[PDB]
Write an enzyme that holds these catalytic residues in place. Structure first.
Site, mmCIF file in Angstrom:
data_model
loop_
_atom_site.group_PDB
_atom_site.id
_atom_site.type_symbol
_atom_site.label_atom_id
_atom_site.label_comp_id
_atom_site.label_asym_id
_atom_site.label_seq_id
_atom_site.Cartn_x
_atom_site.Cartn_y
_atom_site.Cartn_z
ATOM 1 C CG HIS B 41 -26.639 25.014 5.819
ATOM 2 N ND1 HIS B 41 -27.706 24.605 5.888
ATOM 3 C CD2 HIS B 41 -25.781 24.331 7.342
ATOM 4 C CE1 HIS B 41 -28.144 24.508 7.299
ATOM 5 N NE2 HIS B 41 -26.950 24.482 7.880
ATOM 6 N N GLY B 141 -28.162 22.340 15.867
ATOM 7 C CA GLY B 141 -27.012 20.872 15.524
ATOM 8 C C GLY B 141 -28.417 19.812 15.402
ATOM 9 C CB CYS B 143 -29.224 22.057 10.430
ATOM 10 S SG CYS B 143 -30.068 23.179 10.438
HETATM 11 C C1 LIG Z 1 -33.978 32.623 7.561
HETATM 12 C C2 LIG Z 1 -32.876 33.642 9.079
HETATM 13 S S1 LIG Z 1 -33.169 34.591 9.315
HETATM 14 C C3 LIG Z 1 -32.232 35.421 10.407
HETATM 15 N N1 LIG Z 1 -31.419 34.450 10.509
HETATM 16 C C4 LIG Z 1 -31.897 33.152 9.986
HETATM 17 C C5 LIG Z 1 -31.859 31.756 9.895
HETATM 18 O O1 LIG Z 1 -30.315 31.874 8.879
HETATM 19 C C6 LIG Z 1 -30.475 29.918 8.843
HETATM 20 C C7 LIG Z 1 -29.296 29.940 7.912
HETATM 21 C C8 LIG Z 1 -28.625 28.642 7.193
HETATM 22 CL CL1 LIG Z 1 -27.959 28.340 5.148
HETATM 23 C C9 LIG Z 1 -29.078 28.286 8.378
HETATM 24 C C10 LIG Z 1 -29.315 28.240 9.457
HETATM 25 C C11 LIG Z 1 -29.191 26.946 10.434
HETATM 26 C C12 LIG Z 1 -27.695 26.371 10.993
HETATM 27 C C13 LIG Z 1 -28.018 25.843 11.901
HETATM 28 C C14 LIG Z 1 -26.298 24.481 12.372
HETATM 29 C C15 LIG Z 1 -25.429 25.475 11.984
HETATM 30 N N2 LIG Z 1 -24.099 24.732 11.876
HETATM 31 C C16 LIG Z 1 -23.966 23.322 12.715
HETATM 32 O O2 LIG Z 1 -23.136 23.292 12.296
HETATM 33 N N3 LIG Z 1 -25.242 23.146 12.454
HETATM 34 C C17 LIG Z 1 -26.580 23.754 12.771
HETATM 35 O O3 LIG Z 1 -27.105 22.976 13.053
HETATM 36 C C18 LIG Z 1 -28.738 25.387 12.951
HETATM 37 N N4 LIG Z 1 -29.960 26.321 12.845
HETATM 38 C C19 LIG Z 1 -30.964 25.640 13.618
HETATM 39 C C20 LIG Z 1 -31.998 26.118 14.889
HETATM 40 C C21 LIG Z 1 -32.352 26.028 15.915
HETATM 41 C C22 LIG Z 1 -33.762 24.772 14.924
HETATM 42 N N5 LIG Z 1 -33.680 24.862 13.677
HETATM 43 C C23 LIG Z 1 -32.091 25.018 12.909
HETATM 44 C C24 LIG Z 1 -30.132 27.053 11.571
HETATM 45 O O4 LIG Z 1 -31.548 27.734 11.384
HETATM 46 C C25 LIG Z 1 -30.317 29.499 9.385
#
Ligand SMILES: Cc1scnc1COc1cc(Cl)cc(-c2cc(-c3c[nH]c(=O)[nH]c3=O)cn(-c3cccnc3)c2=O)c1
Ligand SMILES: Cc1scnc1COc1cc(Cl)cc(-c2cc(-c3c[nH]c(=O)[nH]c3=O)cn(-c3cccnc3)c2=O)c1
Lengths: 298, 298
Positions: B41, B141, B143
């Protein structure tokens, strides 16, 4: 989201651990620049009542074997500072990080890199207790393991492990060899004295819980003086205006006044947690500083 | 003495974290030999319903910026495997440890090196839940952060972080890009399903408590079948003869028969802990495997 007991990444400290052998005693040492630091009881059977000055006089440089992984170091100098031995070696650790030696205050936290035979086996977080013990996880052979904090790229070494007391808690020194607390490096009974709960850390953890969605314990307000009455009754450290000021950033981010949070804490102390949990714990956790909360919630 | 949630020393993994940027998305990647692994992603606004195949087609090698500290890597290849992106770079990581890619079983534990912008910020231990989530500590951030175990000198990578669900628990993949559990990398509602407590791990922790002097909960005996009735009532995993056999070393060291320990556990489940603590916890802890106990008590 989520809240965990998080240690600092240990790589920079992993590169400085070595094994120190004297006679048949072997423990861990810390190699920084061209100096290796280890507990002076490496030179001790003798531990019941040692004359460290007399025992070190029987030793020469070549009696100290220092092994950095598979690398042998040449010991060209040795001295005693307080309860640490300092071994001058012929090579500077190429892996020496930027670092400082710090004496931390009670209540502050640090990461412990537990080591055996000079090899790291695990990392974990813990706090200097108000009574200058730590509740660590250490087996025989762990002496000389160190505790540290990391700020940007600088490692602040604050702890070297020396002793397990018969109660199973742990005692050690700063890196200049001064014990935390009243302890001496001798195998004889030693009181740690009453411990207490680190109040400012419990409050910081309540702010972390609010930030994470655990809000059930929010309710009233109180006075710094009224709260400290309840603090004393439950063996909590007294709260000072200094502590209030340190909690300011978390109070500002959450919108919850510090004295309002104190009032929540008071009701938890007086009524227990009622079978519920806060951040997955059924007890009030006191080993997160306000800084630890901001780091992990920022 | 003492028992702590202990992570593996993180140094060997610290050397493999890099930052991966695509368009304006930036996350963490894992640089091993001449390949960088990150969540697909990174190529996504689009996350609500992404056609990853279509989106990756708009990309070329030079669209992927890979930074290893202050070192820029040259991307000479790119491919998608399941939900991970694999970026071929022109240089082999000189810091590549010996390693393997492993898909761990539910109940097993691993260390998480939480990272932001390709820089490690903390290490902690956690378990793959029976329902294939983890209860981690991660912010936006994070991920691409990875979970791992270390055996002698070999790093077994088992987890790459992809998602936080709205319930605040975390979901990710093995290093071949296959999610643990039923999850997909799309921002749409996703059920994790009922979790359960990891029975064999709770027993292992009771053995650790006995080894450390916490003995108050020892009492009766039971049958594998009788116990599993009580296990089901309290949403505990069923205990199998395989689990019994894995606990054999701890049973042998403590002299406590496994089914005797099951009988203790049954009474704790049926009567609660009564305000007392075991190894400093007021709840039954299930994130130590039998191996974790032996490592830390050996
Ligand atoms: C399943 C359901 S239902 C309603 N909502 C959700 C969550 O849906 C998703 C799906 C995908 Cl594909 C990705 C994500 C996500 C992306 C990122 C991210 C994006 N860009 C970037 O540049 N850096 C990143 O870190 C970070 N974190 C995140 C946040 C906090 C803790 N851990 C992870 C994420 O959860 C969420
Ligand atoms: C205060 C009281 S009262 C009754 N008894 C005590 C304990 O008295 C002491 C005093 C001193 Cl000076 C040292 C020690 C000690 C030495 C070593 C050690 C020795 N040799 C070696 O080669 N390697 C080592 O690691 C290890 N551990 C140890 C064990 C478990 C956990 N953590 C530390 C120790 O406690 C104990």
């Amino acid at each position: 989201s989520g809240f965990r007991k998080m240690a600092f990444p240990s790589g920079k400290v992993e590169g400085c651990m070595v094994q120190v052998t004297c006679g048949t005693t072997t423990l861990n040492g810390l190699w920084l620049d061209d100096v290796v630091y280890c507990p002076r009881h490496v030179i001790c059977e003798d531990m019941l009542n040692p004359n460290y000055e007399d025992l070190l006089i029987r030793k020469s440089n070549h009696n100290f074997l220092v092994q950095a992984g598979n690398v042998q170091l040449r010991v060209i100098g040795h001295s005693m500072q307080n309860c640490v031995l300092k071994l001058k070696v012929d090579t500077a650790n190429p892996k020496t990080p930027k670092y400082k030696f710090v004496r931390i205050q009670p209540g502050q936290t640090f990461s412990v890199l537990a080591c055996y035979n000079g090899s790291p086996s695990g990392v974990y977080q813990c706090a200097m207790r108000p009574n200058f013990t730590i509740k660590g996880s250490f087996l025989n052979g762990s002496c000389g393991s160190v505790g540290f904090n990391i700020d940007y790229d600088c490692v602040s070494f604050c702890y070297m492990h020396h002793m397990e007391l018969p109660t199973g808690v742990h005692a050690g020194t700063d890196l200049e060899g001064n014990f935390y607390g009243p302890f001496v490096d001798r195998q004889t009974a030693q009181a740690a004295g009453t411990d207490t709960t680190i109040t400012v850390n419990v409050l910081a953890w309540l702010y972390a819980a609010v930030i994470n969605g655990d809000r059930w314990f929010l309710n009233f307000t109180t006075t710094l003086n009224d709260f400290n009455l309840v603090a004393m009754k439950y063996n909590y450290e007294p709260l000072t205006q200094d502590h209030v000021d340190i909690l300011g950033p978390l109070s500002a981010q959450t919108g919850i006044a510090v004295l309002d949070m104190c009032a929540s804490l008071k009701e938890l102390l007086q009524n227990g947690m009622n079978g519920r949990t806060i951040l997955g714990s059924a007890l009030l956790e006191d080993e997160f500083t306000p800084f630890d909360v901001v780091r992990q919630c920022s």
